[model samples]
Target chain A: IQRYVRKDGKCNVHHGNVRAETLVFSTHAVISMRDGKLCLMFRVGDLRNSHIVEASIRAKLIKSKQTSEGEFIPLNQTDINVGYYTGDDRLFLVSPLIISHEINQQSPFWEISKAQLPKEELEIVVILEGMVEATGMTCQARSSYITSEILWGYRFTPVLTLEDGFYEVDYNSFHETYETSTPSLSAKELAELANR
Target chain B: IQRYVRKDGKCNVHHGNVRAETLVFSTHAVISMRDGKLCLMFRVGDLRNSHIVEASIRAKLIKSKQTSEGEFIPLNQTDINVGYYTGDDRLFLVSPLIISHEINQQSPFWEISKAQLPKEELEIVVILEGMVEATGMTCQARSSYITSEILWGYRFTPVLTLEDGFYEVDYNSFHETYETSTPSLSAKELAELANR
Candidate 1:
């Protein structure tokens, strides 16, 4: 019930121990349509300062249901596919790495259309867990996005560039987005149209 | 030093224990050109009968050198890239699966031209290791291809088909190949031509 992320979808974590630095999320978690599938993307910065060694990222979808006591309880948590884009389970963070979640036929949101999304009480939570090299301890960071925070028909701008035999990350436009034309139909409807 | 594979590239494994079946390889291991890169491909059949679980395949390049004792010895064995095509370390075998190794700039054979291949004493060894589900033991299968056996301008024929909501594997043409047009230049030469 507590919000750990800002309205723009950035998350900050502060460790209380000595020599522990705060983890700052650089990009806003947003939803976009890519390659005819819905995707969730975000970025993290200053990986070297955080001293993260081995890391993995995952996503989960939660839906609210009405109980017999007239209480709205969140249930039916489902794991979303995060490896469809990168084809790996490990996080490769060299320079402001962007994590992606691809929603396909196996996803819970596959049948829900753009118009039906707001009517349902849904939330998506992304968690990043890794081992800290300096402290020899495990660290975790998480962010959540509700229905209103999920932007439709938008795509994140490019932030990676090659300069002088090295790659550069543009943090100024890390969370910037541009508008794109997307269909109002669900994934199943779009697939059926192609078959016909 | 010993030749376990046939001239056509078929490998057969014989187990000595009781109830152990002879592993008969159905497809010939061959070298082909795909997507403007040198690729090594082969197929494995009857995965269910072999009781293979959690299998992984890898390739290595070996070159022979004359020692001070006047004997030819294989040295400087280098590992090749096997995950460029499938993007995974494990093998998914629902039917006869074709494993591939892509030769690019990072490969040892990147600078060797088609004409120079016959002059070098080189060999490529592919090894497949996995756990046997029924025997609770580890099993392995390997095959090798020398420079004379590699075809520079060829591609394997398709063996998979969809019929009545099921995937059918055509074992009759699993080892069949078709000719393709290819350049005689090396990988580095091809890359330089694109820059111009």
Candidate 2:
């Protein structure tokens, strides 16, 4: 994470790195329902293609938060697969924007990585704090928050920049021109016009 | 303890109680949180009061058709409690409605019998369930159900009632009614009345 502190001075993500911050995830929730069950949601506030769209929304909220949880030989995962299971509840709410890769071989978004590191995803069940408004309606839970133990991290892609302040985003319209503004497309899409 | 069927639909509660309509619990959860964890509002969905409030919501979620996981506690047991822990993901959306009952006191919502069980009140944590919306932007175990395991069922004191075919709510609406019906000043309020 590029180094920078929030305005309130409560949260801080370091900056001055080799990559630019392109993905963002904020506003997470963990709620406890009466009787004791927990419900959680991992929101993806950003959309950087299928890879980020896939993991960002599901990187948390599961039984195990370890990297091994997605291993193929012993363990792996897939869509939330919501259904009636024997035990605790399990389901998925895939964002409407989620998509598969265009290359099609096996994008990082679909297939589990052979690497030993944890994939960027979120999953969990949480209890919520809802109050009785009157008598018959489903009481919605109040505000929900996340804990540092659970985690809040991001991975940056390659980029070229300077100035310590450049790391932190400034919403104002101060656009800068890139020396090499390359276009992105699949190998097949790029190959179609070879030797033209 | 009430006699129970052997999961095979055999009667046992009253030597053959299965002849009559009976209730069963399938799952349960409980948790608490710090004050101000959530803001709640409740009103009327059917009847009024507390116990009826609980039952009305449960009944509406039920679709006569059998489901793998049952919902709500049997309508014969006593009250349940939801604990408040220090984490955001700890509370389900509805579990924050309970508080700890004072020692050896009867709960205001239930006319508990001292001989059949302990005569203690439960400062319970509960969140109304029948009236929820997608906008308020909250998190729940999406598409999951809440339940209890105790038999004989939880007794009633709620006011919501499902009469004929429609829910006949009598109190405030569970959507925008957020008044604090209960107070956090147990000891002080007691003292103010007469003795602390």
Candidate 3:
């Protein structure tokens, strides 16, 4: 087991960690609907690091305060286990989150009701805030948003961060009236963002 | 020009009117990212009306009040032209709303900034609420929500109305953290719901 420092200033145990500096880049995390379920997918890329590394990227909907510098609070402590990856420089991870309305404990806030809806078009902020642990070192995590609506069949404002090393993305849920829509990302775009 | 009564008791003009009672049902409007554009699709059904009519269903993402009974307010008067359809018995309509971050006047609310987000994952309701004009009659507009998350790959709690001849469905905007993924509807599931 290897120990790594989290953004929370706490130490955690991981099977291994990767060097943040030696790594090439982490692409934007893509969320979409697959088989009628929430699919969380992303790719990690590196050019020179040779040793195979194992890692997991988890996320939670943090209460995003876009006005402030970089302040975010958790809507809840429940973490959506995104995925686990094991590979050299290029890694792709994907998974689905089980959400049943009957189970209030599972998806407490993900849903919004009509009587409780906004009066007009309003902004709903979703932050994919998390960290990647691998190779006995942790990569600094940063956030961003999306490309265009038509190019990807969905338009997103990529969460743009000011930092140089870390990259994170933003995916806002435009009220999809059709059951057949979501934040879709093509494999080709994933490669570019991931530096693969 | 023909005149129809709106939910607010106001009169509007159209080519024709759909009988509030004779029209079988209106499926919850669908929203998606198609070719990077906002695709909104829906269906209208009528079983016994003898006369075929021409009509179009339009929708706008309205801010809503959930706790109150049948209360929804318009944030703006802008109606994103949903789709146009002309048929008898059953009709399906699909169209896209043009959105460009570069174009502020187009899709201002769909894109959000950290500074402009809502306080919580509060309800952002979408009402396919509107009137269909054709066959010399106009239909009264009602609203709704989806059921479980699994049905249609997305469940809708159809706005259960006490009234006899109307239904409203909800489409919620969930913050897509790796945590709360979006409410994605599969095309197959939508077909079932559109029929139901």
Candidate 4:
């Protein structure tokens, strides 16, 4: 993280700190047949200020189970270990540029993490978000504006340069940079379907 | 299912057995934006041997959540009350052709089923194979051969007539239909640049 986010190796500058709080996000499971063998690939996307990004991330893969009464038992158990990475790691990068604006033009490009779907029979899939929290180096440019809403109102103010020198910019300047490409499925929708 | 699978509701044949099991398939949660508000569209895909092209499916939507241990809680809580179709209803068709070959020439086009994605943060995806099963109306001509491996040796026996006089084959029969236009995300390369 230091090498990727900072130069001179010195953490400088908003509430600028490692802000070591690890949050996680995962994707819906994909079940497909490939090469005559069934396989699944689970992916993780994460980003943080230099300090937080560098901190080690502890993670695991869990399976979803369904029981009587139409209950979806989420994250019930550990899935099969990906053995092929044993012969060779298959993890790949989705982009080439680092720190470049994400395709969405919000967050800067960060590393992508993933685990392979060990061969198994699965009804469906889901993912866990993040692990532990810690503190780290320093914050930079637009920290709070970006982190606030995502971290549930944990306001991390930003830094802006003034005509004479450096100062705070208008908060409006910090509009929500992050927007989910997908819409939120309504709770009502789930109920209607359930009753039907 | 009866009306959709066979001309007569009697349900005979697939290797000729009263195979009576109903399994459901789901699709990846589709993420998209609508109007100024965010919304997700959940859909379901199904097919049958009844040879009837039209079938009615009642459907609904759900949401995703998380657990403390960082386990992915997929489709957990019922998001918003989507409101009963009390005023009316809505369901869409993925295909109008019944028992029609799938878009895949190699693999037949199969049923597609999906519920909506609940609101959540995500940066990943994965899939699992189908689970528990019963029997089907009539195995298509190639049913036994393909399913033997997929079904883990449930043994879908084939049929042969002594006279072997006439066989039902439209040969203008089935033509490979699905054409994948998206440039396969080239397997040889990880489009992402590593240096960044």
Candidate 5:
């Protein structure tokens, strides 16, 4: 719990999901069938999993976002909005407007621990901004138009939490959310004053 | 939500103290330290587990209603009363006689899942029971002392009902039961009537 209490008060999701406030270091939480890392969706309006072909095909849609980076393919944006990526930096804690939640009723935002699933524990976050960032493309293009398809919030359970010191993850619920709330200050403004 | 169902009809717990209808699982439900059939648990009295070995240490216990011809330890009766066992079973799902607090009141049970937890899990019954039974002993003083760990109930999933199922199990929390309503006469009677 102390690890998450940064001087700024924002907690870091460890190993993707373990938050500081609720973990017990004495135990390791086994995240079940979790898909670790976040995916930035790519679009290929044509062809089912066109991103796959584009990623592998060096196909027409390949030009959209370097889709052919080897054997990689983004999922269908209609229902499967996850774009597969590797490495840790792509991961993030699903921050609910935790501040907005009432005391005692607050939910610790989920985090991705492992990267894969076994049907029961299925989660993925659709980060709209990340989509824009990763695709390196503007909105409005048929390929670029995507609903929020970020899968970063699966209950960030650090190795030591009161909620079972073991880090576990889940998905497949018809519901899970990533906060759309941004402070009134835009990115440029916050950097200018050097403070929010 | 339906996962934590107890031996009783209720699916929650009695916090701080034991009460009727109070189901007890592991203090926490995730076990990242586990591998295969190995589960980590600190014995109730010892930070170290009472069964210092991986599993199947039942034959070596201090007391026995049952004994095996093999090198395994004979069942010692002293292990009981001191909480060394829930009547010589490996893992057990225990609950209060009736609901401890109000039926609707929440304790710690609902917070856990019915899966491969550290010490708590749905498979605990079969695991522990089979462990003791496999000792090549019976349930009487000549066998292993046993009793009503779980009340009468059917499984949520039908037996051998899946070919595509990722895991094999005889139960699921999904199937509904009306508080001992199944009234299977032999569920406990069968086990209790051992050596007769």
Candidate 6:
């Protein structure tokens, strides 16, 4: 589970002058396959204590290649489709929120397939930016997932449960995943199959 | 004036099945500078005739170079910042809207200076997308500006004039621009000057 979930031990806080009360916590991060598309999920917690406004997520794919000088050169960088998952770019973030990124053909991850995953040196960098509710100052948190960190044909287990009219999140189950059946085709190939 | 202003000429409607009543018009588009930042302004008109919801603008920079094979090869593509000018990604298009893109250090245009502008074969592609009020189908309009089309150190003349009970837009002055003295430094250089 630790291998699958990338956990930020400390609250990934940006803006060094931020107040402690305004800090937001993203407990767990996971990459899974949902509805035949690659999804990046972040379980954001501690919303009840902190005030966050204009919270949003953005992501991009960075591909690097080694040159003759023995240094890795960035070959390409493409923005991923993070807006399609959320109706608007901003999130309410009032409760335990699950921010997701659904990768499709429009996304840079469309060309990446299970067969080609092993050979590619690509990284998906995700950044979460928002305003601290009290100060209105912007704060940011970042995380990334390389090819090996992405688990194929897997789904994240639900962590939210109901208890006495209030919702409870089991932090232990946040990183848990279960294997699921998914085609090893690339996103482009999967889209073609659906059209046919 | 015709070269500086990239007029859509025909409303630049997308989604052919859209009803005539739901068509939005962007009368004139101008690339100018405001407060030491490159600004793209679109004088949108005919809001009284059309109902638009969730109107927003997005842009990207595409750079191409001729290869040895005599084919234009795309060298790089970068997303331009359109959200900085507007407080939010969504816009309320109930009135004559002047959607602006303020290009600063964070924008792709930062690297381009007045001297290098002529030599670079780069294009700034802008897209406006909104939902038709009646059908709820998405509609898009696109426009592009090449190197020569961008007028630096220029500001867009005011087009809005108050009338008896409402305001009227003088379409004749929409494309009009007057030159002002500004440093020919790149956006990166401008930032350095401010800090020093």
Candidate of highest lDDT: 1
Give the per-residue Cα lDDT of candidate 5 at A177: 32
TM-score of chain B of each: 0.74, 0.19, 0.32, 0.24, 0.17, 0.71
Off by over 4 Å in 5: A1-115, A118-151, A154-176, A180-196, B1-196
Q: Report the C-alpha displacement of residue A108, candidate 1, in angstroms.
A: 19
lDDT of 2 by residue, B62-151 (tens): 212223586534323333222112111121221112122222233232333223222332222233332223223222211222222111
How do the residues B68-161 of candidate 6 rate in per-residue lDDT, one tens digit apiece? 3232322223456666344454666544456676657566667667787677666555555665577555554545555666666666677666
Candidate number that wins on DockQ, 2 or 4:
2
The docking quality of candidate 5, as DockQ, is 0.01
Summarize candidate 1's per-residue lDDT along A73-160 as a digit string, tens digits: 2232345677734645477455556667665677767777778867767766555556666666555555556666566666677777
Please give the lDDT score at residue B93 for candidate 5.
Answer: 20
TM-score of each: 0.46, 0.21, 0.22, 0.18, 0.16, 0.44
Question: In model 3 chain B, where is the ten-residue run with the lowest total lDDT?
Answer: B94-103
TM-score of chain A of 2: 0.20
Model 2, range A88-110, lDDT digits (tens) per residue?
12212112111111222222222
Clashes of each: 0, 102, 66, 47, 56, 0
Descending-TM-score candidate ranking = 1, 6, 3, 2, 4, 5
lDDT (Cα, tens digit) per residue for candidate 5, span B125-184: 111221111122222112221222222221111111212422122323212222212222
Query: DockQ for all models, in order?
Result: 0.01, 0.02, 0.01, 0.01, 0.01, 0.02
Tens digits of lDDT, candidate 3, B1-196 = 2323457743232222332233322233334434433333333333222333233333333222221222122121123322222212122221111211111223323443223332222211122222233433323222222221101111222322222222322212111111222224433333345576
Model 1 docking category: incorrect
Task: Write one digit per residue (lDDT tens) for candidate 5, span A120-183.
Answer: 2222211111112233322211111111222322232222332333222232111233333222
Residue by residue across B11-126, what tens digits does model 4's lDDT show? 22233332232222222222121221122222222233322111122222233555788887775532121211210111111112111111111211111111111122322111
Quote the lDDT for B85 in model 2.
20
Model 2 CA lDDT for position B179: 21
Instruction: Indicate the residue-level lDDT of A195 in model 3.
Output: 72
Summarize candidate 4's per-residue lDDT along A52-129 as a digit string, tens digits: 331221112223444342324332322122322142222221111011111111111111111111222222111121
Q: Model 2 interface RMSD, in angstroms?
A: 18.7
lDDT of 2 at B119: 31
